[model samples]
Target: MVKVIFFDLDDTLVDTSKLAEIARKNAIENMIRHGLPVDFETAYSELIELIKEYGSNFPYHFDYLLRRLDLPYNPKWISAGVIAYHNTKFAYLREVPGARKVLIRLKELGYELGIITDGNPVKQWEKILRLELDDFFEHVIISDFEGVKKPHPKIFKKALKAFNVKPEEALMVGDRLYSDIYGAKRVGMKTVWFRYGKHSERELEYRKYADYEIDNLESLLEVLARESSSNKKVHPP
Candidate 1:
């Protein structure tokens, strides 16, 4: 029987990739408006490439964007981009549909919930707090804090240790097959592949690792209910 459920924060609980795409586009548009000399399509794609090269957590994206465009660093355009990006993120941060209801129901079912995510702690916590999801989780393990990302057994083991629950008693729900499913499965936890994010289109090499797959967050309730009933029959307690 599963007593604890660990979820990936970005694409699992919230539409993070979608949100980031929109935020970046808004930032590019604002930079163009503030005397940047590039068209939206050119600047936007360049910025995407820059993000790919520098990684998402890199702080000076706009500064580097200007440098790459061969323009001197101008605070006006950079600040415009930054403010627009942040404003879009602040206004648009939202939970995945049915995320709140699913979490509440899971709590009622006596499951301890947690977040196992890979990102900067402050940024990840901002999303949780902004989406008002911080109250639902009993533990939140961030890869940055642990210095080990998902797909590493150590991070999964840390979460299991936090609740003092064996891996078999835990279920990991996430969208990434490479990270969440593979890591949790390696650690002996049941894995659920949530097929509702950007990674849904990914190839199926890692699909075999997931013990279960869900298209919607609400479907998790059904999965857990079945697991509980089956375990009850086996244990006869």
Candidate 2:
């Protein structure tokens, strides 16, 4: 029995892509306004490269970019735009179709829920809290709040520890193959890969890392119902 469902916050649970992309572009424009001589073309390339190397800190690309220009530290500017993106643009963020229904149904099916997420505590929680979704979750673990990050097995360990559940008892659902799938799979937790339409091209070399793949929440229901029927034995929830 699968006891818990650990969710990835950003693109997996909420539709964060639209606002996040907007934030990045605005941040780039803000940098340009601050006398950086880069066009959007260069900005986009730089953004991905920064993520390729730094991973989650990718959005803070302007922090590094601004430093290279010997400009004053502008963490506030970054936060300003990020806050604007989240509060204004992302505040109207849509959940994936069937997302709420799937989650509530899973809870009714006796699954303990958790959020293994990244980014600022206030902003990230703001998304959850303002959405009026907290009551559904047993815990919400934020990277910055927890002082840990994804693909780092320690973070998953921490989540499982909090839930007091075994890895075999949980299912991790997320959009990122690198961070969520690989890490959870390594720890003996099954993974559901959410193949959002905005994905970049990738190698299928590591497909084994995920136990299942679906484009959205509705498909997840099918897989889980099948799994429940097929097993019926108590391996975990």
Candidate 3:
């Protein structure tokens, strides 16, 4: 029987793509107001282009963006963009539709929950708090704190250890196949891929690695219910 279910933060429980895009647009507007000489459309486009190389969470995105645009980096100017990004991002941060109900229902059914996410600890923690996800998960593992990110067996091992569970006794749910599904499956855990997230062509190409696929968090309840019943027959639990 599955004793613990670990979830990825971005796009699995939270609607990060939407919030990140909105924050990105706000940051561009803020930078423009601070005398960055690019129009909103061009600035946003260039920002997205740069993010392809450096993921959206890269700290020096503004620095690279300015340099790529042939503008000298000004601390004060970049600060405006950074500040606006945080302000706007937190303003609209929220859990995915039906995410809370699923979490609560799973808890009521006696499943242990955890958050295993890859990102800067401070930023990821802020999202957990803003989305009020801290209450549902027993263990919140941010890669920065552990010094090992996803796709690494070490991180998945950490989660398995935290719950005192063998890999086969755990279920990992995530949006990315490379990190979430691959890492968990490599460690011998069952994998569920959340396909509703915004993904690059490369990220989408590996969906076959997942043991199960879900388009919504609510659907996980059904998957787990079926799995629970199946386990009862196999193990007589």
Considering every candidate listed, which one attains the maximal TM-score?
A: 1
Number of residue pairs clashing in candidate 1, backbone atoms closer than 3 angstroms, sequence gap of 3 or more or interchain: 0
CA-lDDT, candidates in order: 0.89, 0.76, 0.86
Residue pairs of candidate 1 with colliding backbone atoms: none
Native-to-model Cα distance after best TM-score fit, residue 183 in candidate 1, in Å: 0.7
* All candidates: TM-score: 0.87, 0.70, 0.81
Measured over all alpha carbons after superposition, the RMSD of each candidate to the real structure, in angstroms, is 3.1, 5.2, 3.4
Candidate 3 Cα lDDT to native: 0.86
lDDT of 2 at 85: 45
From the highest TM-score down, the ranking of the candidates is 1, 3, 2
Q: In angstroms, what RMSD does candidate 1 have relative to the true structure?
A: 3.1
Question: After superposing candidate 2, which stretches have Cα over 4 Å from the reference?
Answer: 22-91, 197-204, 229-237
- CA displacement after TM-score superposition, residue 87 of candidate 3 (Å): 2.3
TM-score-wise, the better of 1 and 3 is 1
Report the Cα lDDT for residue 24, model 2.
68
Q: Taking the tens digit of each residue's C-alpha lDDT, what string does model 1 give over 83-185?
A: 9998998898888888899998988878899999998899889889888888789899987877888888889999999999978889999988999898899
